[PDB]
Design a protein around this motif. Structure first.
Motif, PDB file in Angstrom:
ATOM      1  N   UNK A  70      -3.250   6.138   9.803  1.00 62.63           N
ATOM      2  CA  UNK A  70      -2.126   5.771  10.584  1.00 62.63           C
ATOM      3  C   UNK A  70      -0.748   6.262  10.063  1.00 62.63           C
ATOM      4  N   UNK A  80      -9.095   2.468   6.989  1.00 60.31           N
ATOM      5  CA  UNK A  80      -9.317   1.326   6.147  1.00 60.31           C
ATOM      6  C   UNK A  80     -10.255   0.346   6.785  1.00 60.31           C
ATOM      7  N   UNK A  97     -13.124  -3.142   5.800  1.00 66.85           N
ATOM      8  CA  UNK A  97     -13.084  -4.497   5.138  1.00 66.85           C
ATOM      9  C   UNK A  97     -13.685  -4.547   3.723  1.00 66.85           C
ATOM     10  N   UNK A 110     -14.919  -3.419  10.386  1.00 68.51           N
ATOM     11  CA  UNK A 110     -13.528  -3.795  10.695  1.00 68.51           C
ATOM     12  C   UNK A 110     -13.116  -5.144  10.175  1.00 68.51           C
ATOM     13  N   UNK A 111     -14.068  -5.928   9.662  1.00 60.98           N
ATOM     14  CA  UNK A 111     -13.754  -7.257   9.170  1.00 60.98           C
ATOM     15  C   UNK A 111     -13.828  -8.312  10.254  1.00 60.98           C
ATOM     16  N   UNK A 169     -10.121  -1.900  16.021  1.00 62.46           N
ATOM     17  CA  UNK A 169      -9.144  -1.344  15.082  1.00 62.46           C
ATOM     18  C   UNK A 169      -7.721  -1.455  15.546  1.00 62.46           C
ATOM     19  N   UNK A 174      -5.114  -4.085  13.386  1.00 55.22           N
ATOM     20  CA  UNK A 174      -4.283  -3.001  12.929  1.00 55.22           C
ATOM     21  C   UNK A 174      -3.362  -3.565  11.845  1.00 55.22           C
ATOM     22  N   UNK A 211      -5.549  -4.580   8.336  1.00 52.95           N
ATOM     23  CA  UNK A 211      -6.251  -3.587   7.522  1.00 52.95           C
ATOM     24  C   UNK A 211      -5.264  -2.583   6.797  1.00 52.95           C
ATOM     25  N   UNK A 212      -5.533  -2.290   5.514  1.00 46.59           N
ATOM     26  CA  UNK A 212      -4.704  -1.373   4.670  1.00 46.59           C
ATOM     27  C   UNK A 212      -5.506  -0.884   3.450  1.00 46.59           C
TER      28      UNK A 212
END
Ligand SMILES: [Co+2]
Ligand SMILES: [Co+2]
Lengths: 262, 259
Positions: free
Chosen positions: A199, A234, A236, B136-137, B251, B255, B258-259
């Protein structure tokens, strides 16, 4: 061209069509199959050359076929589902000439996006990426090295027709690297080692080639060195456990994020 | 004796493993098949009940299996190939108990995202969505209405092991609406009529449930009406594969986290 009727699996002409299941046969005829009346019609409007048609609109397409110079086979339910290998099939099936855009005739312009796939092996993934790239507005798919065949029955089907609509190019690794160097492109490669957040990447300055790695192996170092930026999505955990189609979709929608609106 | 050798494809015990291709036997035994030594290992570590192990680390898995109650079966490579139905199969296969989470026991909280699938039918879509929601969690998958079976062999395969890692719940439309109405959630449904750009929706104020319509019929009125927002993904010239579209939704909903 001409019309002709067939009901025997043993018929010479039917053996030739069924042989398009195999890669080596398709390569020698440079041909392929696509199922669907509508799809056959759309393919003709997009300039695809049709070699054989098989089955009221049905009748003007049969007309257009013979007129440009190719066969037309009326057939029984048992033959059509043999060649398409489905118990419950579509009534219509075209056999077209394959087409690849030569890589050196591609000159990326401002606002464009290409997707380059290094040794993509799954026909499901390849077909889904082609469709998705078409939905997103990409200008082309570039298949790098030895990949699964974009014109196989399983890939074509998973395109839901997008195989007729977005150009596809193929190249070995050396020619690809040369083309990319001279194209004035921003090459964004997904590659876990050495990566930034997808991003934060600059998708606006230059046309983008999104370079994706093989499902299991990923990109090799020589492709990865060729990149203007290394991308990661990214997740989890510290894992990259995204299906290649899914990651490719995510990247297309980010790279064209500033270009797609409602 | 919990360890046992089998030769014959006729052997009763091998016919029962092959019966897990039928949905009805899967349902009445509550069980299913997952292939792969690394997968079986991860399942045992995640705390799934193994009923049956079929085949160094193999020795370690075999002992987790006897110690947790299961049966071990040493077998010819012919046997392994016949239960799977795959050329060149993995050398280890686990038979596990199915686990659904009851819907009523999920209380969504701030920062959580769930995926609800409305009558998803394709096994490969279901499986890639489970795997993507895991990556994606997301905290749960919610199968709404009649769906393809998440514990079929084809779905489990497409999950790459993620079937073990993210809870799965199932509910008829009505129990979902009931749950959803009491749960404190923002339901964001992909649905064309009345929709906004997915990128302008509020994914921060409440725990989000992404509701994804059936692949061809889309969402019935009962579900669409309950949604707090209707989303859509701008395209050039509406036709994303369900699983790609779900990945893109997940996602964006996540947004900011997530990082
Ligand atoms: Co040949
Ligand atoms: Co039974």
């Amino acid at each position: 061209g001409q019309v002709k009727e067939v009901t025997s699996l043993t018929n010479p002409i039917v053996k030739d069509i069924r042989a398009l299941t195999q890669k080596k046969h398709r390569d020698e005829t440079r041909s392929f199959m696509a199922e669907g009346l509508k799809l056959v019609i759309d393919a003709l409007d997009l300039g695809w050359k049709i070699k054989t048609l098989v089955y009221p609109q049905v009748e003007q397409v049969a007309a257009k076929t013979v007129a440009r110079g190719g066969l037309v086979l009326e057939v029984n339910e048992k033959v059509i589902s043999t060649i398409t290998r489905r118990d419950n099939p579509q009534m219509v099936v075209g056999i077209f000439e394959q087409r690849y855009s030569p890589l050196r005739d591609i000159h990326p312009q401002e606002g464009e996006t290409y997707v380059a796939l290094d040794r993509v092996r799954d026909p499901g993934n390849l077909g889904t990426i082609i469709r998705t790239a078409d939905a997103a507005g990409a200008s082309g798919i570039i298949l790098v090295g030895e990949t699964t065949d974009p014109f196989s029955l399983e890939t074509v089907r998973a395109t839901m027709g997008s195989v007729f609509a977005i150009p596809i190019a193929r190249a070995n690794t050396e020619d690809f690297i040369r083309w990319q160097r001279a194209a004035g492109v921003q090459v964004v490669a997904t590659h876990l080692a050495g990566s930034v957040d997808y991003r934060t990447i600059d998708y606006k300055s230059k046309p983008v080639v999104l370079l994706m790695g093989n499902e299991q192996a990923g990109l090799p170092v020589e492709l990865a060195r060729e990149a203007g930026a290394l991308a990661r999505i990214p997740q989890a955990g510290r894992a990259d456990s995204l299906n290649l189609a899914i990651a490719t979709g995510i990247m297309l929608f980010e790279a064209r994020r500033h270009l797609l609106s409602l």
